[PDB]
Design a binder for this molecule. Structure first.
Ligand code: HEM
Length: 180
């Protein structure tokens, strides 16, 4: 299930707006889920000298469990786009597995403003694309995405209505994990 091809970062985006606060996923669009479980997610991206580090949380809304990761990658020469390898961690950020060289994700920022963002994530393992997602992001749980980001969704060729809205899933977040 190939990741979407025509994906490049929006040029002219202020990186200070993207590497800002934390993000909560309000809406996600999954091309082809392998599992039918639905997730909520929040993460806290930071950048220094072209290196991105981010604390990542997933909550399985069906099973009511959560898992944790730390991503690390370099910004491309193209703008706000990065391929990250990732550690697997417990809730206290103790390392369970270190980043390896065959598992990565590529995150492309399509829009970002003071309240909201739209990003695309392709997850890979070895020679295979595992999964492609678009995600609408806000800085507080269940905040409304901005008009600018809703327009970004339409301009990406998508319909926001076809995304899964996470409000309905009964998400639980770990704001301690994502603080810092
Ligand atoms: C609501 C939004 C999201 C959904 C629905 C979602 C869905 C998924 C699913 C279904 C998996 C597979 C879990 C498994 O069976 O092991 C997964 C793993 C993963 N996701 Fe997400 N995801 C979301 C947000 C994010 C974001 C924002 C990022 C990166 C910034 C991300 C990065 C990853 C990574 C690195 C893995 C691999 C974890 C592992 O192998 O341990 N995801 N996600």
């Amino acid at each position: 299930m190939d990741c979407s091809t025509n994906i490049s970062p929006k040029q002219g985006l202020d990186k200070a707006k993207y590497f800002s606060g934390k993000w909560y996923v309000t809406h996600f669009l999954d091309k082809d889920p392998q599992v039918t479980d639905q997730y909520c997610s929040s993460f806290t991206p930071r950048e220094s000298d072209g290196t991105v580090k981010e604390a990542l949380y997933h909550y399985n809304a069906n099973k009511k469990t959560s898992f944790y990761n730390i991503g690390e990658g370099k910004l491309e020469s193209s703008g706000l786009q990065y391929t990250a390898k990732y550690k697997t961690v417990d809730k206290k950020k103790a390392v369970l597995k270190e980043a390896d060289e065959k598992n990565s994700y590529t995150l492309t920022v399509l829009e970002a403003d003071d309240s909201s963002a739209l990003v695309h994530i392709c997850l890979r393992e070895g020679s295979k694309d595992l999964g492609d997602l678009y995600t609408v992001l806000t800085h507080q749980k269940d905040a409304e995405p901005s008009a600018k980001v809703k327009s970004a969704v339409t301009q990406a060729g998508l319909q926001l209505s076809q995304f899964v809205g996470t409000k309905d899933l009964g998400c639980q977040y770990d704001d301690q994990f994502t603080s810092l």
